[PDB]
């Protein structure tokens, strides 16, 4: 019957904005624009966002609020045959929390390393340096910048590792930072959305404060317009390319994050008659708007480097951790009052991750709380166990070969693996459960049914624009490599298991509960195609 709701409505929005807005809104989207032709990239981006991303973002939020249950229980009550999806979805979210939280730890490490008069990554004369160290980014892989060597040879001590087979010693400064991360995550998700929804007031909003400050500091610097030019310049030649629409898609999907069961879990605490259609639209926009804004934040500073610091643009324009932990701090160090810009930046990165991590965790806790009554009342004790598992196993990310472990999970934990989950999320709703039955559900809530636009998107466009991008990513697949290091053939297979162990739950739990229920022939499917009420 009655489950707790959001202490306030803003708590929900900030939770969803917070979860959606993450480090990829910073270190991925702006890179994609620069790579894919600038404001021209917004067209496949916008399209994929409009037809693929927002409808599935909207779909998840609607489902959560309507069925009032976590990821697992929701799909059990929706399409009992496909209940495996809820397992896949949660288990995916389980894998990402292993992987994602260490990024926050890096941010906190850089933060704790930012209390000083002179930032350690400015020069090449430190002990961790190599004779090949140059002041800023370059071309030849053999010669790293000062920030690259600080990150790799000091913070990570990745130089001390020969691959994922050798993790080496554990960094106890990093293990400390990772612990601090899981401490913050615990006491946010401790008592549930009572505290959680209040905590995201900081973690979701704070980056916008820092973004603005860096936006102004960024645009107030020489050569800032040049960076914006590299960022937004409309080369439409990339639209014709296949992998650009693939990039525009996977980003849109990963940025909004349906299929992690986060939107499901977060919405399950909404009041039934709340208008979730305006929430999904409001959140979709703000998330993408933040990516657009951060684009200026990154590239205004990226342009400043190609002007005053005498570096080539393709070297400093980077995705992933490389951008925020190496390239951007390298710039900060040069400009006046650097220590301030550093402290807020790394705190931004942490607060970009946390609320995103809150969601992933909540997706798991809520899903498990609704499934097993031995969870919900015990929640204080459960999240302790979960994060203890996260920490202990996560110590592998704090090793000297920690990045190699991170980078592996980065690719295989979620991935196109989330796309097949979301693809099965769309097919189950639109076809098995049905759109006419789903539109009717939303009508009862918000007062009006979704336009035919959303329905076609859920029924036709999104599955199509999912299926074919997840296929074109398999043909464009190549073995995992970081820098000069090539992961062994067995490391690839381990990642596939990680990517597989989730997705296989969809056919496995299907087959299992298909053999489990009494019946025969056709109508065995009726039992598993009839929803919770029917």
């Amino acid at each position, epitope marked *: 019957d009655e489950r707790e709701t959001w202490s306030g409505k803003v708590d929900f929005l900030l939770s969803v904005i917070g979860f959606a807005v993450d480090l990829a809104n910073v270190w991925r989207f702006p890179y994609l624009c620069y790579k894919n032709g600038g404001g021209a990239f917004l067209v496949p981006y916008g399209i994929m966002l409009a037809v693929g991303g927002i409808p599935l973002f909207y779909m998840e939020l609607a489902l959560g609020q309507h069925n009032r249950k976590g990821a697992i229980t929701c799909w059990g009550r929706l399409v009992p045959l496909f209940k495996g999806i809820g397992y896949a979805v949660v288990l995916i979210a389980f894998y990402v929390d292993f992987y994602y939280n260490v990024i926050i730890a890096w941010s906190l490490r850089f933060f704790f390393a930012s209390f000083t008069n002179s930032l350690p990554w400015t020069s090449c004369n430190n002990i961790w340096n190599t004779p090949n160290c140059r002041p800023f980014e370059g071309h030849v892989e053999g010669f790293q910048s000062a920030a690259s060597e600080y990150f790799n040879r000091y913070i990570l001590e990745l130089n001390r590792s020969e691959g994922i087979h050798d993790l080496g010693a554990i960094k106890w400064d990093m293990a400390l930072c990772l612990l601090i991360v899981y401490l913050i995550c615990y006491f946010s998700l401790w008592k549930g959305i009572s505290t959680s929804g209040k905590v995201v007031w900081f973690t979701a909003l704070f980056p916008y404060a820092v973004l603005l400050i860096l936006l102004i500091r960024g645009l107030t610097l020489p050569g800032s317009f040049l960076g914006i030019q590299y960022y937004l310049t409309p080369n439409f030649s990339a639209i014709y390319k296949a992998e650009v629409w693939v990039d525009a898609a996977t980003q849109v999907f990963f940025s909004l994050g349906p299929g992690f069961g986060v939107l499901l879990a977060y919405a399950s605490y909404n009041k039934y008659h709340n208008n979730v259609y305006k929430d999904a639209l409001l959140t979709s926009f703000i998330n993408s708007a933040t990516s657009f804004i951060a684009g200026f934040v990154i590239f205004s500073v990226l342009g400043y480097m190609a002007h005053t610091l005498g570096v080539r643009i393709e070297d400093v324009a980077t995705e992933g951790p490389g951008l925020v932990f190496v390239v951007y701090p390298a710039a900060i160090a040069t400009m006046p009052a650097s220590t301030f810009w550093a402290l807020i930046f790394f705190m931004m990165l942490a607060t970009l991750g946390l609320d995103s991590s809150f969601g992933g965790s909540e997706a798991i806790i809520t899903a498990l709380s609704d499934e097993f009554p031995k969870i919900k009342r015990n929640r204080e004790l459960f999240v302790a166990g979960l994060f203890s598992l996260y920490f202990v196993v996560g110590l592998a990310s704090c090793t000297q070969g920690g990045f190699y472990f991170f980078h592996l999970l980065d690719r295989y934990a979620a991935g196109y693996s989330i796309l097949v989950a979301v693809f099965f999320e769309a097919i189950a709703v639109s076809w098995i459960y049905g759109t*006419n*039955r789903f*539109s*009717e559900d939303i*009508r*009862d809530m918000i*007062g*009006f*049914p979704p336009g035919r636009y959303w329905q076609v998107c859920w029924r036709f466009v999104a599955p199509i624009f999912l299926l074919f991008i997840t296929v074109y990513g398999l043909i464009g697949y190549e073995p995992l490599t970081y820098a000069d290091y090539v992961y062994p053939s067995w490391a690839n297979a381990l990642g596939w298991c990680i990517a597989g162990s989730s997705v296989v739950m969809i056919p496995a739990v299907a087959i299992f509960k298909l053999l489990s229920t009494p019946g025969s022939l056709r109508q065995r499917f009726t039992i598993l195609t009839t929803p919770w*009420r029917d």
Partner: antibody
Amino acid sequence: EVQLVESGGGLVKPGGSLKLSCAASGFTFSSYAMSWVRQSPEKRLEWVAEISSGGRYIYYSDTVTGRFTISRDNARNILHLEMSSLRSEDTAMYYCARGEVRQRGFDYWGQGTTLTVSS
Amino acid sequence: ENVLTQSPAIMSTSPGEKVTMTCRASSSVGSSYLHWYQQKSGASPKLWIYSTSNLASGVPARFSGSGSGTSYSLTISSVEAEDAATYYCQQFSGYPLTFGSGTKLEMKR
């Protein structure tokens, strides 16, 4: 275009039972929620019951609740209201009113059929 | 239930004059969920104004709605003999759905 035709209705002994039907035409019937709004001889409009597009969501006014049963045939495009233990205060003109959108109200009404409950 | 009361009960007006009728709710009604219906003598009600300011199809521009919260109003800028009818407001915000007591607009001669 859109036509709603109420049928049935007439004299019924108090405590008696009667079933009203509405013939919907000119629109996809399965796509819209339907409601019964009755108008007393005092011309007071009272919403009786609402059925959703799929018949899976039902609401009743506290007046008719448990006595009246609103059902739906999407195959034959017919809306039903099944009445039982009818009382003299149930005497009114029963309207078949369509609207799906709560924010748009009832955009189409029938000619109405008349129920008289008296001994 | 949420009871909507309308005033005046009966209203007489000469063609061309402005009329305003009011609809008051016991509980607050979302501006999006409040609607108005016109019912001519011996005829079915017709959707007239929906979502408080929005005229329905066929409805002349002379009609306008306004208001929010517990207080709403229908206003005919210049009345025609064609406009003599009984006007009911309504709320869809919650259940049971309720109709206003209604305003009978009659022509003054």
